[PDB]
């Protein structure tokens, strides 16, 4: 799920190294997240975290071992659009949708360098 | 490359178990292939074998370990159409194209049970 989400984000933002640009941004983008999102990018991360939390409730996802970001699915990037594959079973397809949505949200919101590596001393 | 081609064929032929229906069909469909194709399905297999042979000449493919059918790429099946992903590097994208083409060829040609497990005693 993580490398596929990395690839999805580059599908939408071809200039980005997502694992570098969006990890540890604000309160939500990265491992965990808590507190009020600092901006709309952070709010895209918040929704993605909630999406993932939702996925873990599927008995389709519970049939698996992973850190949520290792539920590997199939998607294509074609002309900068993401298509989640009908080959994904239920869990993967749900995560595929979570990841497509966040990649698109990230491409539509402002990126604020101030919130990069934001001091967690109050999220 | 093999499980992705399996998935591609089911994308086009949703009633099929491709690893069962198309393996060891005619002279070409399966490991190797030699002789004159027995029918157009077999000719789709012949073209796919030649495609794979072509791929091995890419220095992009030579940078890898696999049996040709383990050059794993990314594609989506959506509404029974295959899209090879812009995330594939050169070798994978070439194999993705080989596999998409054969899956489509298979869906357009007659399937002849006579040629299933055809006696190789003259291909
Ligand atoms: Ca998070
Ligand atoms: Ca063959």
Swiss-Prot record, chains A, B:
Primary location: secreted
Keyword Mitochondrion: no
Function of the protein: Secretory calcium-dependent phospholipase A2 that primarily targets dietary phospholipids in the intestinal tract. Hydrolyzes the ester bond of the fatty acyl group attached at sn-2 position of phospholipids (phospholipase A2 activity) with preference for phosphatidylethanolamines and phosphatidylglycerols over phosphatidylcholines. May play a role in the biosynthesis of N-acyl ethanolamines that regulate energy metabolism and inflammation in the intestinal tract.
Cofactor binding description: Binds 1 Ca(2+) ion per subunit.
Intrachain S-S bonds: 11-77, 27-123, 29-45, 44-105, 51-98, 61-91, 84-96
Residues of the full protein shown: 23 to 145 of 145
Catalyzed reaction equations: a 1,2-diacyl-sn-glycero-3-phosphocholine + H2O = a 1-acyl-sn-glycero-3-phosphocholine + a fatty acid + H(+); 1,2-ditetradecanoyl-sn-glycero-3-phosphocholine + H2O = 1-tetradecanoyl-sn-glycero-3-phosphocholine + tetradecanoate + H(+); 1,2-dihexadecanoyl-sn-glycero-3-phosphocholine + H2O = 1-hexadecanoyl-sn-glycero-3-phosphocholine + hexadecanoate + H(+); 1-hexadecanoyl-2-(9Z-octadecenoyl)-sn-glycero-3-phosphocholine + H2O = 1-hexadecanoyl-sn-glycero-3-phosphocholine + (9Z)-octadecenoate + H(+)
Named cofactor requirement(s): Ca(2+)
Location(s) in or outside the cell: Secreted
Residue positions binding Ca(2+): 28, 30, 32, 49
Active-site residues from the entry: 48, 99
UniProt entry tagged with the keyword Metal-binding: yes
GO cellular component, one term: cell surface
First-level EC class: hydrolase
Family: Belongs to the phospholipase A2 family.
Swiss-Prot/TrEMBL GO biological process terms: antibacterial humoral response; antimicrobial humoral immune response mediated by antimicrobial peptide; arachidonate secretion; defense response to Gram-positive bacterium; fatty acid biosynthetic process; innate immune response in mucosa; lipid catabolic process; phosphatidylcholine metabolic process
GO MF entry, a single one: calcium ion binding
PTM characteristics: Activated by trypsin cleavage in the duodenum. Can also be activated by thrombin or autocatalytically.
Subunit structure: Monomer or homodimer.
Name of the gene this protein is made from: PLA2G1B
UniProt organism field: Bos taurus (Bovine)
Keywords, alphabetical: Autocatalytic cleavage, Calcium, Disulfide bond, Hydrolase, Lipid metabolism, Metal-binding, Phospholipid metabolism, Pyrrolidone carboxylic acid, Secreted, Signal, Zymogen
Descriptive protein name: Phospholipase A2
Documented EC number(s): 3.1.1.4
